[PDB]
């Protein structure tokens, strides 16, 4: 049984129901190739200078990722394509509002480019969020997913170059005794395609077997606004913030947030008023 493949335009309403049922779907042409090109060009130098995940100069080293992984997050100050095109993706927002409506507003838990060096080994099969949000393990097993992960190919995903592994249905597994690479299927994808999984989907990056190809992806973990993002936009220059849409501002933590509770009293408010109202935060002011 293979990962279902859906069109970003044609099949839009089918995407989240497909993930909710099977734990994974491939969104074909999630980002256009022109956006992929621009993202790539804009993040390239930051990828090249990024040290190892656990670099000694970091005061929050990532000890989990392999030394042949590079991960660059807080993309808004680096990439116009990301902060305009990606953060405003209609497809992305329709899926997130489909996924998160029971909880409320959602935001970017982390937007990162990952680049894997040739011969990068397969990651251990895993669910996300367990090195950041242990609260998630305490959720009842039937609780709606509180985060999801769009793994967007910025270069080709093939079985040979380490395309992601997923276990279909594994987001509903309580008993993990059956986890093995035996149960996986691959996300074979063209640049701009996205693999969409939930925080309970068991998955892993694949083994890069060519010894030559450098695989790159954009991972967008979207999560309910009641959960703290893994990354901070607090240091993004205010001019950059004020060039965004209000929606993009909210996604980066530069706006207040709402839950779905009928009498919701809000998140990140100030004596009854929003961040953006208190600070008189402008939007869509070009640089
Ligand atoms: C550790 N880890 C990340 O760094 C990561 C990277 C991109 C997007 C999400 C994310 N969150 C995570 O929880 C993963 C978990 C993991 C990663 C590699 C091997 C085993 C487990
Ligand atoms: O490399 C991949 O395709 C998967 C990345 C991943 O699962 C993670 O880093 O949490
Ligand atoms: Fe993962």
mmCIF file of C-alpha atoms and ligand atoms in Angstrom:
data_model
loop_
_atom_site.group_PDB
_atom_site.id
_atom_site.type_symbol
_atom_site.label_atom_id
_atom_site.label_comp_id
_atom_site.label_asym_id
_atom_site.label_seq_id
_atom_site.Cartn_x
_atom_site.Cartn_y
_atom_site.Cartn_z
ATOM 1 C CA UNK A 1 0.000 0.000 0.000
ATOM 2 C CA UNK A 2 1.616 3.208 -1.205
ATOM 3 C CA UNK A 3 1.408 6.770 0.068
ATOM 4 C CA UNK A 4 -1.657 8.439 -1.518
ATOM 5 C CA UNK A 5 -0.812 11.184 -3.983
ATOM 6 C CA UNK A 6 -3.025 14.257 -4.301
ATOM 7 C CA UNK A 7 -3.027 17.388 -6.444
ATOM 8 C CA UNK A 8 -2.615 20.640 -4.544
ATOM 9 C CA UNK A 9 -5.341 22.303 -6.667
ATOM 10 C CA UNK A 10 -7.642 19.525 -7.873
ATOM 11 C CA UNK A 11 -7.696 17.458 -4.672
ATOM 12 C CA UNK A 12 -7.309 20.231 -2.071
ATOM 13 C CA UNK A 13 -10.266 19.154 0.074
ATOM 14 C CA UNK A 14 -9.046 15.544 0.084
ATOM 15 C CA UNK A 15 -5.612 16.195 1.524
ATOM 16 C CA UNK A 16 -6.221 16.480 5.255
ATOM 17 C CA UNK A 17 -8.890 13.716 5.358
ATOM 18 C CA UNK A 18 -6.344 11.511 3.570
ATOM 19 C CA UNK A 19 -3.625 12.242 6.149
ATOM 20 C CA UNK A 20 -6.065 11.923 9.032
ATOM 21 C CA UNK A 21 -6.958 8.449 7.766
ATOM 22 C CA UNK A 22 -3.630 7.076 6.482
ATOM 23 C CA UNK A 23 -1.104 9.230 8.387
ATOM 24 C CA UNK A 24 0.578 10.482 5.201
ATOM 25 C CA UNK A 25 -0.094 11.962 1.798
ATOM 26 C CA UNK A 26 2.008 13.404 -1.000
ATOM 27 C CA UNK A 27 0.858 16.817 -2.190
ATOM 28 C CA UNK A 28 2.013 17.016 -5.787
ATOM 29 C CA UNK A 29 3.210 20.495 -6.781
ATOM 30 C CA UNK A 30 2.721 21.969 -3.300
ATOM 31 C CA UNK A 31 5.245 24.698 -4.165
ATOM 32 C CA UNK A 32 5.805 25.759 -7.766
ATOM 33 C CA UNK A 33 9.272 25.220 -9.202
ATOM 34 C CA UNK A 34 9.820 28.980 -9.379
ATOM 35 C CA UNK A 35 9.256 29.210 -5.615
ATOM 36 C CA UNK A 36 11.548 26.197 -5.096
ATOM 37 C CA UNK A 37 14.222 27.875 -7.203
ATOM 38 C CA UNK A 38 13.964 31.128 -5.255
ATOM 39 C CA UNK A 39 13.974 29.440 -1.839
ATOM 40 C CA UNK A 40 17.014 27.396 -2.841
ATOM 41 C CA UNK A 41 18.930 30.457 -4.056
ATOM 42 C CA UNK A 42 18.025 32.469 -0.980
ATOM 43 C CA UNK A 43 18.959 29.862 1.627
ATOM 44 C CA UNK A 44 22.024 28.416 -0.164
ATOM 45 C CA UNK A 45 24.714 30.459 1.616
ATOM 46 C CA UNK A 46 23.085 29.888 5.001
ATOM 47 C CA UNK A 47 23.120 26.137 4.353
ATOM 48 C CA UNK A 48 26.800 26.252 3.381
ATOM 49 C CA UNK A 49 27.817 28.097 6.569
ATOM 50 C CA UNK A 50 25.614 26.099 8.972
ATOM 51 C CA UNK A 51 27.768 23.924 11.286
ATOM 52 C CA UNK A 52 26.899 20.431 12.538
ATOM 53 C CA UNK A 53 23.646 20.096 14.512
ATOM 54 C CA UNK A 54 25.575 19.626 17.814
ATOM 55 C CA UNK A 55 28.284 22.238 17.092
ATOM 56 C CA UNK A 56 30.165 23.284 20.230
ATOM 57 C CA UNK A 57 29.446 26.982 19.576
ATOM 58 C CA UNK A 58 25.690 26.397 19.945
ATOM 59 C CA UNK A 59 24.023 26.791 23.304
ATOM 60 C CA UNK A 60 21.072 24.687 22.094
ATOM 61 C CA UNK A 61 22.892 21.964 20.142
ATOM 62 C CA UNK A 62 20.757 19.366 18.397
ATOM 63 C CA UNK A 63 22.229 16.029 19.476
ATOM 64 C CA UNK A 64 19.643 13.945 17.592
ATOM 65 C CA UNK A 65 20.358 14.853 13.954
ATOM 66 C CA UNK A 66 23.309 13.198 12.213
ATOM 67 C CA UNK A 67 26.545 15.116 11.646
ATOM 68 C CA UNK A 68 25.836 14.889 7.884
ATOM 69 C CA UNK A 69 22.599 16.870 8.309
ATOM 70 C CA UNK A 70 22.452 20.672 8.084
ATOM 71 C CA UNK A 71 19.341 22.375 9.413
ATOM 72 C CA UNK A 72 18.624 26.092 8.998
ATOM 73 C CA UNK A 73 15.480 27.471 10.684
ATOM 74 C CA UNK A 74 14.190 31.017 11.288
ATOM 75 C CA UNK A 75 13.893 31.393 7.509
ATOM 76 C CA UNK A 76 11.853 34.617 7.407
ATOM 77 C CA UNK A 77 14.886 36.970 7.610
ATOM 78 C CA UNK A 78 16.680 34.920 5.012
ATOM 79 C CA UNK A 79 14.093 34.191 2.360
ATOM 80 C CA UNK A 80 11.545 36.410 0.609
ATOM 81 C CA UNK A 81 10.090 33.336 -1.132
ATOM 82 C CA UNK A 82 9.455 31.716 2.278
ATOM 83 C CA UNK A 83 8.079 34.697 4.167
ATOM 84 C CA UNK A 84 5.800 35.760 1.277
ATOM 85 C CA UNK A 85 4.951 32.741 -0.880
ATOM 86 C CA UNK A 86 5.238 29.875 1.603
ATOM 87 C CA UNK A 87 3.766 31.493 4.706
ATOM 88 C CA UNK A 88 0.795 32.646 2.586
ATOM 89 C CA UNK A 89 0.306 29.311 0.784
ATOM 90 C CA UNK A 90 -3.419 28.864 0.266
ATOM 91 C CA UNK A 91 -2.938 25.113 0.140
ATOM 92 C CA UNK A 92 -1.027 25.168 3.404
ATOM 93 C CA UNK A 93 -3.636 27.220 5.185
ATOM 94 C CA UNK A 94 -6.600 25.219 3.971
ATOM 95 C CA UNK A 95 -4.919 22.058 5.226
ATOM 96 C CA UNK A 96 -3.999 23.586 8.592
ATOM 97 C CA UNK A 97 -7.488 24.972 9.176
ATOM 98 C CA UNK A 98 -8.857 21.549 8.187
ATOM 99 C CA UNK A 99 -6.471 19.910 10.695
ATOM 100 C CA UNK A 100 -6.541 22.358 13.602
ATOM 101 C CA UNK A 101 -10.096 23.721 13.734
ATOM 102 C CA UNK A 102 -10.983 21.719 16.827
ATOM 103 C CA UNK A 103 -8.181 23.521 18.730
ATOM 104 C CA UNK A 104 -8.035 27.049 17.333
ATOM 105 C CA UNK A 105 -5.375 29.111 15.592
ATOM 106 C CA UNK A 106 -2.221 27.456 14.387
ATOM 107 C CA UNK A 107 1.278 28.744 13.757
ATOM 108 C CA UNK A 108 4.734 27.760 12.612
ATOM 109 C CA UNK A 109 6.373 25.527 15.156
ATOM 110 C CA UNK A 110 9.390 25.364 12.840
ATOM 111 C CA UNK A 111 10.200 26.215 9.223
ATOM 112 C CA UNK A 112 13.606 24.735 8.366
ATOM 113 C CA UNK A 113 15.685 23.794 5.368
ATOM 114 C CA UNK A 114 17.413 20.455 5.844
ATOM 115 C CA UNK A 115 20.273 19.412 3.624
ATOM 116 C CA UNK A 116 21.680 15.927 3.783
ATOM 117 C CA UNK A 117 25.185 15.214 2.639
ATOM 118 C CA UNK A 118 25.979 12.360 0.257
ATOM 119 C CA UNK A 119 25.829 9.003 2.072
ATOM 120 C CA UNK A 120 23.731 10.453 4.879
ATOM 121 C CA UNK A 121 22.413 7.404 6.799
ATOM 122 C CA UNK A 122 18.759 6.670 7.393
ATOM 123 C CA UNK A 123 17.297 8.250 10.488
ATOM 124 C CA UNK A 124 15.807 5.969 13.144
ATOM 125 C CA UNK A 125 12.054 5.586 12.704
ATOM 126 C CA UNK A 126 10.422 8.213 14.887
ATOM 127 C CA UNK A 127 7.505 10.458 15.713
ATOM 128 C CA UNK A 128 8.288 14.147 15.836
ATOM 129 C CA UNK A 129 7.972 16.498 18.852
ATOM 130 C CA UNK A 130 9.453 14.092 21.438
ATOM 131 C CA UNK A 131 12.670 16.152 21.950
ATOM 132 C CA UNK A 132 10.798 19.445 22.424
ATOM 133 C CA UNK A 133 7.206 18.841 23.578
ATOM 134 C CA UNK A 134 6.943 15.904 26.008
ATOM 135 C CA UNK A 135 3.397 17.131 26.788
ATOM 136 C CA UNK A 136 2.374 15.536 23.481
ATOM 137 C CA UNK A 137 3.042 12.047 24.812
ATOM 138 C CA UNK A 138 0.477 12.622 27.533
ATOM 139 C CA UNK A 139 -2.340 13.269 25.105
ATOM 140 C CA UNK A 140 -5.033 10.620 24.877
ATOM 141 C CA UNK A 141 -4.342 8.334 21.874
ATOM 142 C CA UNK A 142 -7.479 9.550 20.061
ATOM 143 C CA UNK A 143 -6.788 13.278 20.551
ATOM 144 C CA UNK A 144 -6.701 15.167 17.220
ATOM 145 C CA UNK A 145 -3.172 15.841 16.006
ATOM 146 C CA UNK A 146 -1.757 19.041 17.527
ATOM 147 C CA UNK A 147 0.991 19.445 14.908
ATOM 148 C CA UNK A 148 1.715 18.298 11.360
ATOM 149 C CA UNK A 149 4.816 18.365 9.196
ATOM 150 C CA UNK A 150 5.002 19.337 5.546
ATOM 151 C CA UNK A 151 8.217 17.845 4.178
ATOM 152 C CA UNK A 152 8.680 19.740 0.921
ATOM 153 C CA UNK A 153 11.263 18.444 -1.546
ATOM 154 C CA UNK A 154 13.659 21.156 -2.667
ATOM 155 C CA UNK A 155 15.422 18.555 -4.853
ATOM 156 C CA UNK A 156 14.356 15.135 -6.154
ATOM 157 C CA UNK A 157 13.410 12.429 -3.648
ATOM 158 C CA UNK A 158 14.309 8.985 -4.978
ATOM 159 C CA UNK A 159 14.684 5.675 -3.181
ATOM 160 C CA UNK A 160 18.378 5.845 -4.084
ATOM 161 C CA UNK A 161 19.018 9.317 -2.619
ATOM 162 C CA UNK A 162 17.236 8.700 0.690
ATOM 163 C CA UNK A 163 13.589 9.640 0.124
ATOM 164 C CA UNK A 164 11.602 9.699 3.362
ATOM 165 C CA UNK A 165 10.129 6.481 4.815
ATOM 166 C CA UNK A 166 6.669 6.433 6.382
ATOM 167 C CA UNK A 167 4.555 3.693 7.969
ATOM 168 C CA UNK A 168 0.974 4.131 6.808
ATOM 169 C CA UNK A 169 -1.552 3.953 9.616
ATOM 170 C CA UNK A 170 1.199 4.258 12.245
ATOM 171 C CA UNK A 171 -0.226 7.526 13.592
ATOM 172 C CA UNK A 172 -2.954 5.360 15.197
ATOM 173 C CA UNK A 173 -0.561 2.745 16.617
ATOM 174 C CA UNK A 174 -0.394 2.438 20.366
ATOM 175 C CA UNK A 175 1.515 -0.877 20.244
ATOM 176 C CA UNK A 176 4.930 -0.144 18.685
ATOM 177 C CA UNK A 177 6.207 -3.743 18.629
ATOM 178 C CA UNK A 178 5.601 -3.838 14.857
ATOM 179 C CA UNK A 179 7.819 -0.852 13.984
ATOM 180 C CA UNK A 180 10.435 -1.824 11.412
ATOM 181 C CA UNK A 181 11.725 -0.591 8.075
ATOM 182 C CA UNK A 182 9.824 -3.621 6.751
ATOM 183 C CA UNK A 183 6.581 -1.736 7.230
ATOM 184 C CA UNK A 184 7.543 1.405 5.428
ATOM 185 C CA UNK A 185 6.824 2.906 2.073
ATOM 186 C CA UNK A 186 8.740 5.724 0.383
ATOM 187 C CA UNK A 187 7.818 9.307 -0.521
ATOM 188 C CA UNK A 188 9.160 9.597 -4.068
ATOM 189 C CA UNK A 189 8.825 13.224 -4.997
ATOM 190 C CA UNK A 190 9.739 15.908 -7.454
ATOM 191 C CA UNK A 191 10.973 19.289 -6.228
ATOM 192 C CA UNK A 192 7.987 21.229 -4.911
ATOM 193 C CA UNK A 193 6.099 18.109 -3.932
ATOM 194 C CA UNK A 194 5.429 17.807 -0.187
ATOM 195 C CA UNK A 195 5.071 14.817 2.091
ATOM 196 C CA UNK A 196 2.471 15.625 4.764
ATOM 197 C CA UNK A 197 2.518 13.649 8.024
ATOM 198 C CA UNK A 198 1.184 14.181 11.533
ATOM 199 C CA UNK A 199 3.136 14.312 14.788
ATOM 200 C CA UNK A 200 2.121 10.674 15.343
ATOM 201 C CA UNK A 201 3.221 9.371 11.932
ATOM 202 C CA UNK A 202 6.213 7.050 12.288
ATOM 203 C CA UNK A 203 8.757 8.044 9.639
ATOM 204 C CA UNK A 204 12.420 8.484 8.941
ATOM 205 C CA UNK A 205 14.715 10.095 6.448
ATOM 206 C CA UNK A 206 16.089 7.474 4.090
ATOM 207 C CA UNK A 207 19.630 6.295 3.494
ATOM 208 C CA UNK A 208 21.494 8.185 0.783
ATOM 209 C CA UNK A 209 22.970 5.330 -1.309
ATOM 210 C CA UNK A 210 24.406 7.080 -4.376
ATOM 211 C CA UNK A 211 27.325 8.626 -2.495
ATOM 212 C CA UNK A 212 26.960 11.684 -4.758
ATOM 213 C CA UNK A 213 23.555 13.360 -4.462
ATOM 214 C CA UNK A 214 22.778 16.109 -1.953
ATOM 215 C CA UNK A 215 19.116 15.939 -0.976
ATOM 216 C CA UNK A 216 17.410 19.035 0.407
ATOM 217 C CA UNK A 217 13.951 19.699 1.805
ATOM 218 C CA UNK A 218 11.881 22.376 3.490
ATOM 219 C CA UNK A 219 10.234 21.055 6.672
ATOM 220 C CA UNK A 220 7.293 23.146 7.894
ATOM 221 C CA UNK A 221 5.930 21.889 11.204
ATOM 222 C CA UNK A 222 2.568 23.560 11.652
ATOM 223 C CA UNK A 223 0.998 23.364 15.094
ATOM 224 C CA UNK A 224 -1.769 24.748 17.215
ATOM 225 C CA UNK A 225 -0.942 28.134 18.691
ATOM 226 C CA UNK A 226 -1.308 26.697 22.222
ATOM 227 C CA UNK A 227 2.066 24.946 21.691
ATOM 228 C CA UNK A 228 5.383 26.794 21.809
ATOM 229 C CA UNK A 229 7.362 26.912 18.587
ATOM 230 C CA UNK A 230 10.706 25.224 18.455
ATOM 231 C CA UNK A 231 12.177 28.376 16.900
ATOM 232 C CA UNK A 232 11.970 32.078 17.742
ATOM 233 C CA UNK A 233 11.235 35.000 15.440
ATOM 234 C CA UNK A 234 11.751 37.525 18.270
ATOM 235 C CA UNK A 235 15.030 38.709 16.730
ATOM 236 C CA UNK A 236 13.708 39.129 13.179
ATOM 237 C CA UNK A 237 14.128 42.840 12.327
ATOM 238 C CA UNK A 238 10.852 44.696 12.705
ATOM 239 C CA UNK A 239 11.035 46.052 9.104
ATOM 240 C CA UNK A 240 10.986 42.466 7.853
ATOM 241 C CA UNK A 241 8.014 41.621 10.080
ATOM 242 C CA UNK A 242 6.112 44.688 8.878
ATOM 243 C CA UNK A 243 6.569 43.655 5.240
ATOM 244 C CA UNK A 244 4.541 40.490 5.835
ATOM 245 C CA UNK A 245 0.839 39.804 5.705
ATOM 246 C CA UNK A 246 -1.058 39.809 9.017
ATOM 247 C CA UNK A 247 -1.454 36.080 8.524
ATOM 248 C CA UNK A 248 2.298 35.546 8.101
ATOM 249 C CA UNK A 249 2.879 37.790 11.117
ATOM 250 C CA UNK A 250 0.599 35.611 13.246
ATOM 251 C CA UNK A 251 2.376 32.454 12.061
ATOM 252 C CA UNK A 252 5.706 33.845 13.294
ATOM 253 C CA UNK A 253 4.445 34.797 16.787
ATOM 254 C CA UNK A 254 4.156 38.529 15.960
ATOM 255 C CA UNK A 255 0.393 38.564 16.608
ATOM 256 C CA UNK A 256 -1.922 37.423 19.328
ATOM 257 C CA UNK A 257 -3.595 34.028 18.908
ATOM 258 C CA UNK A 258 -7.066 32.541 19.476
ATOM 259 C CA UNK A 259 -8.285 29.167 20.677
ATOM 260 C CA UNK A 260 -11.461 27.532 19.417
ATOM 261 C CA UNK A 261 -13.126 27.677 22.842
ATOM 262 C CA UNK A 262 -16.527 29.379 22.330
ATOM 263 C CA UNK A 263 -15.697 32.133 24.875
ATOM 264 C CA UNK A 264 -11.971 32.081 23.978
ATOM 265 C CA UNK A 265 -9.993 34.644 25.988
ATOM 266 C CA UNK A 266 -6.994 34.468 23.643
ATOM 267 C CA UNK A 267 -3.258 33.744 23.752
ATOM 268 C CA UNK A 268 -0.421 36.328 23.901
ATOM 269 C CA UNK A 269 -2.828 39.166 24.615
ATOM 270 C CA UNK A 270 -2.123 42.409 26.435
ATOM 271 C CA UNK A 271 -4.745 43.592 28.972
ATOM 272 C CA UNK A 272 -7.472 42.544 26.541
ATOM 273 C CA UNK A 273 -5.806 43.762 23.354
ATOM 274 C CA UNK A 274 -3.718 42.075 20.695
ATOM 275 C CA UNK A 275 0.027 42.380 20.175
ATOM 276 C CA UNK A 276 -0.558 43.910 16.767
ATOM 277 C CA UNK A 277 -3.045 46.455 18.153
ATOM 278 C CA UNK A 278 -0.871 47.300 21.177
ATOM 279 C CA UNK A 279 2.321 47.722 19.155
ATOM 280 C CA UNK A 280 0.553 49.369 16.173
ATOM 281 C CA UNK A 281 2.225 46.726 14.033
ATOM 282 C CA UNK A 282 2.088 47.554 10.331
ATOM 283 C CA UNK A 283 1.673 44.872 7.664
ATOM 284 C CA UNK A 284 2.659 44.620 4.009
ATOM 285 C CA UNK A 285 4.986 47.636 4.178
ATOM 286 C CA UNK A 286 7.640 46.918 1.528
ATOM 287 C CA UNK A 287 11.314 47.162 2.438
HETATM 288 C C1 LIG B 1 15.347 15.797 16.311
HETATM 289 N N1 LIG B 1 14.279 16.140 15.369
HETATM 290 C C2 LIG B 1 14.488 17.294 14.612
HETATM 291 O O1 LIG B 1 15.504 17.910 14.755
HETATM 292 C C3 LIG B 1 13.558 17.764 13.679
HETATM 293 C C4 LIG B 1 13.977 18.279 12.341
HETATM 294 C C5 LIG B 1 13.055 18.737 11.415
HETATM 295 C C6 LIG B 1 11.653 18.749 11.722
HETATM 296 C C7 LIG B 1 11.300 18.261 12.998
HETATM 297 C C8 LIG B 1 12.165 17.797 13.980
HETATM 298 N N2 LIG B 1 11.610 17.337 15.186
HETATM 299 C C9 LIG B 1 11.970 16.126 15.789
HETATM 300 O O2 LIG B 1 11.406 15.795 16.782
HETATM 301 C C10 LIG B 1 12.995 15.338 15.192
HETATM 302 C C11 LIG B 1 13.032 13.825 15.831
HETATM 303 C C12 LIG B 1 14.123 12.928 15.236
HETATM 304 C C13 LIG B 1 15.061 13.427 14.147
HETATM 305 C C14 LIG B 1 15.995 12.623 13.673
HETATM 306 C C15 LIG B 1 16.127 11.202 14.204
HETATM 307 C C16 LIG B 1 15.324 10.774 15.151
HETATM 308 C C17 LIG B 1 14.253 11.699 15.698
HETATM 309 O O1 LIG B 2 15.147 13.368 5.985
HETATM 310 C C1 LIG B 2 13.897 13.219 5.939
HETATM 311 O O2 LIG B 2 13.366 13.058 4.811
HETATM 312 C C2 LIG B 2 13.049 13.193 7.219
HETATM 313 C C3 LIG B 2 13.457 14.232 8.288
HETATM 314 C C4 LIG B 2 12.809 13.926 9.660
HETATM 315 O O3 LIG B 2 12.036 13.028 9.751
HETATM 316 C C5 LIG B 2 13.187 14.737 10.925
HETATM 317 O O4 LIG B 2 14.302 15.323 10.883
HETATM 318 O O5 LIG B 2 12.458 14.814 11.996
HETATM 319 FE FE1 LIG B 3 10.896 13.645 11.551
#
